[PDB]
Each structure stands twice: as structure tokens, then as C-alpha cells.
Amino acid sequence: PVARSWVCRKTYVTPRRPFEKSRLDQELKLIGEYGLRNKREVWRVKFTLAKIRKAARELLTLDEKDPRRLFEGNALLRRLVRIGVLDEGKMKLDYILGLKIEDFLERRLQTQVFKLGLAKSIHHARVLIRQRHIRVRKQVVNIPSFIVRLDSQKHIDFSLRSPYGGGRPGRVKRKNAKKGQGGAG
């Protein structure tokens, strides 16, 4: 008897046929186009898509004008529009199942940095993010995979308390200013 949770899940599912070739080809291409650190980070997106797909399927099995369907399906569509994946007007559930990986990768801080100019390559973008150089809204979102809400897109920029954003310069230039001051001069 304690406090504590013990409530945790896995966020991804590995592929069965582990050397398919065609699968490996597609996953690596995804890694290239969006600078992912690892195969499984792809598989995490795939899996969050899959859950959605299961949820959608389940709703389509319910008869239309079944309360359970109406409410839950709408909430799912509302949730999906919130992130910038579905368009308003396209909201009616069948359109979820025609919806792919790339749409969900397209809304990461790492993209919506590199997408909003700001970066200079996607790997740079990922480095920026880690190095506390870019702030969403008013917090320094350290994390690349931060799914950027459509609501929250236009508030992406550099972090105030940083070299790029317009603050104190980093420790390399500080050193090279000390070297020019005392050593050379």
C-alpha cells in the first residue's frame, strides 16, 4: 500500500516483418525529410495515427444518430482540427481514415520552426529547439515533437533570454570578445 500510479503505456508498436525492404525504405525517407533521431520516433507517430484510425473505424460501425457516435466522433474531429491536420468543412469522420503519417509529422515544433523560416535546415531546427533558443508563445519548448496546435502556430519565435532572440550572447563569443580585449588588444 503506497501512493503512486503504475499507470504507463507504450507509445509505439514495432513492425512484424522486420526486414521487408520496402518498409525500411519508406521509414528512412521519413527520417530524412523530417530530421528524426531514430526509427521508433516514426513508429510513435504511426501508432498515434493508428489509434485514431481504430477510433474512427469504431464510430463508423455505430449507426448514424447514435448518441455515442455523434459526441465522440465530433470530439475526435475537433481534436484533429486543433492540431492542423484536418480542415473545417472536411469534418465528418470518413475523412479521418484518408489521413496519413506525413500530415502528423508536419505539425512538430521541428517542422513549424523550419517551416516558419527561423531555422536554416531541419537538423539545425532540431538543434535550435533542444538548445532553448526557440519559445512557443511564452515558454521555451525544449522538445522537438511538441505537436503545434493550429491555434498556437503564429506565436512561434526565438526565446527572449537568448543570443538569437535578442539577449546576452553565448559563451563562445564572450570568450572571443575576452581574447580580443585582453590578449590581442
Binding site: 528512412l28 525517407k29 527520417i31 530524412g32 530530421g35 528524426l36 533521431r37 531514430n38 526509427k39 537538423h123 532540431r126
Partner: protein, 57 residues
């Protein structure tokens, strides 16, 4: 029948060799970058009856 003598005959009598040196290899994302770059942009040439990522004529 048959002895238990030779046991590590071949592990014994191989010609010993240094393990060379080259470089600090790119790890993590950087590695994955590198490999995606060298299958999907750099080469992509005119074909001549299939490829080989460790071929040797």
C-alpha cells in the same frame, strides 16, 4: 574417441593484426541523416543492372 587437444587451434594460430584507426563516427540522428543522404539524393544515377552497398569487383 578423439582427443581434446587442438581446442583453440585456429583461435591460437591466426595471424594477429591491429584494429586500424579512422574516425569518431556519426551517431544518432546524424548517422540516420548521413545514410538517408547517401541513398536518396547524392547518387541516384543511371542504372546498370542493379546496385550493391558493399560490392567489390
Amino acid at each position: 574417441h578423439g582427443s581434446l587437444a587442438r581446442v583453440g587451434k585456429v583461435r591460437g594460430q591466426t595471424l594477429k593484426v591491429a584494429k586500424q584507426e579512422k574516425k569518431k563516427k556519426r551517431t544518432g540522428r546524424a548517422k540516420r541523416r548521413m545514410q538517408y543522404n547517401r541513398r536518396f539524393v547524392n547518387v541516384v544515377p543511371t542504372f546498370g543492372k542493379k546496385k550493391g552497398p558493399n560490392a567489390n569487383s
